[PDB]
Ligand SMILES: CCCCCC/C=C\CCCCCCCCCC(=O)OC[C@H](COP(=O)(O)OCCN)OC(=O)CCC/C=C\CCCCCCCC
């Protein structure tokens with residue numbers, strides 16, 4: 001049976017669906033008082049049908065067990081003794097669970113007709129792997145309680161990896177061009193903007209600019225030729241505390257809201273860092289200017305200033321770009337969808353796959369990552385109550401329309417490949433955005449023939465109402481026609497899939513090594529550009545506990561690829577197609593066209609990567625999950 005809009009469904013359909021929605025609303029319940037994320041709309045609890053499937057669980061547990069084994073193996077034999085039996089037991093039990101899963105799958109295959117008799121056993125396996133994860137929880141608590149015993153000046157930052165290979169950034173982090181390239185190809189491709197005139201509170205002058213870029217360049221010429229780009233972290237607010245923040249677990253930490261200027265040379269061959277101010281007030285933050293190789297008295301001040309930017313970057317990236325603007329946005333769309341679009345509504349069928357695992361992973365962020373003494377309280381400088389409030393405020397202020405990729409690119413004046421040629425997030429992102437848009441256009445056209453079909457759809461009206469109201473999605477507005485609906489669906493889908501991928505999957509290769517990036521520093525911003533030493537810079541590096549949590553959490557969160565954009569098949573048993581409607585699934589139809597377009601996009605991106613200075617692979621469709629689930 002094809003899905004239907006409520007105004008067209010037959011009566012038995014209409015009453016069945018309104019009763020289903022009355023039921024859904026008892027199961028999927030809004031709160032703004034979820035523990036550790038006050039003010040953000042959340043599910044009160046995760047319904048049974050929203051727990052992760054076995055396939056996700058085995059993937060996630062697999063990575064976690066690899067990390068446990070790696071940790072235990074890095075310990076001295078004496079310390080390892082406390083944990084070896086437990087670690088061996090987790091490995092063996094996970095393997096046992098894989099085998100149960102594989103047996104169940106082969107049993108279903110031997111008699112597909114009898115496969116419904118297996119569903120309790122499939123949920124029993126889900127329960128079992130979740131219980132395995134509870135045991136992991138207990139082991140993590142124990143490791144952390146014994147952190148003192150277990151846990152060029154940087155050897156401790158290598159040691160925490162065990163036998164995991166250090167990422168490339170461990171080699172290249174001090175390099176100026178590499179630093180600049182984070183701005184366009186790193187986990188946070190969103191903050192960088194063109195600058196036409198400098199902020200008043202960033203008094204970089206003509207003479208300083210020419211010192212760096214050459215006597216034949218100028219601020220005026222560079223600005224006018226679209227060669228100046230600014231990173232300004234003012235929006236971090238309380239994520240950049242004024243001073244020292246003393247915590248029990250990590251001692252004294254600092255973070256920052258700096259401003260940094262980058263420029264292209266006249267040949268536009270690449271972005272170069274020009275100047276950094278380590279906070280918003282120039283009266284208390286001197287100007288650091290890019291030093292020449294011979295200026296050994298400026299060298300370490302400049303390394304310190306870049307580390308200041310990178311501290312700000314982890315705070316901005318993780319709390320805003322990643323948690324607030326992917327995870328916590330998709331939370332709202334998940335809840336509105338289940339509460340207001342009947343399961344037989346075609347938009348429910350389309351969107352549900354894009355929220356698989358979202359409620360679960362988000363409850364995990366709040367319960368595990370955000371309480372006092374949790375990962376974020378360890379890894380991020382600000383008091384945890386300030387972090388929670390600031391991330392939440394950022395989610396609440398995120399404008400849905402202004403946040404769409406093309407609008408973002410335009411508002412920041414970074415949408416012109418002629419002016420800023422090397423911007424992989426922009427160029428690959430647009431390919432994926434546009435492919436999704438055509439799919440959304442095609443799919444909408446199946447079910448909505450007129451703008452009348454959009455305005456007369458009472459479920460869609462209720463959905464918009466809940467997204468605006470209970471969901472507190474800023475900038476969302478009434479949907480009055482088909483083209484608008486398409487732009488909306490494109491954004492909801494892109495957000496859930498590609499955007500999350502682009503800002504989540506860089507975590508292992510770019511964020512696991514604390515000297516290259518960390519959301520806390522152990523020292524104030526450099527007080528002068530001149531006369532700093534390696535020892536002054538080393539003082540900024542975090543306590544080892546920070547590094548230990550960092551390598552493990554960022555490896556995990558970027559190593560689970562579950563589901564794939566466009567596949568539209570269940571990702572757990574029985575792995576059936578999402579769509580039944582032959583208008584969607586037919587040969588040469590909307591779905592096949594979307595699938596084929598994504599492979600075209602993949603081929604284009606691979607071609608682009610052969611010619612890039614470094615490959616950018618996060619927006620390869622083959623590496624984009626349909627949902628935000630890790
Ligand atoms: C950091 C900023 C991220 C921002 C984005 C956050 C958004 C979404 C991500 C939310 C992710 C939520 C957390 C991951 C969820 C994993 C799937 C899951 O649900 O696992 C649940 C278990 C059990 O939970 P429970 O509450 O009973 O006990 C917590 C400890 N009191 O949690 C973990 O395995 C702990 C984290 C494993 C950390 C790495 C294992 C390290 C083992 C090796 C040695 C470790 C030494 C430390």
Ligand SMILES: [Fe+2]
Nearest residue numbers: 500504557630
């Ligand atoms: Fe994520």
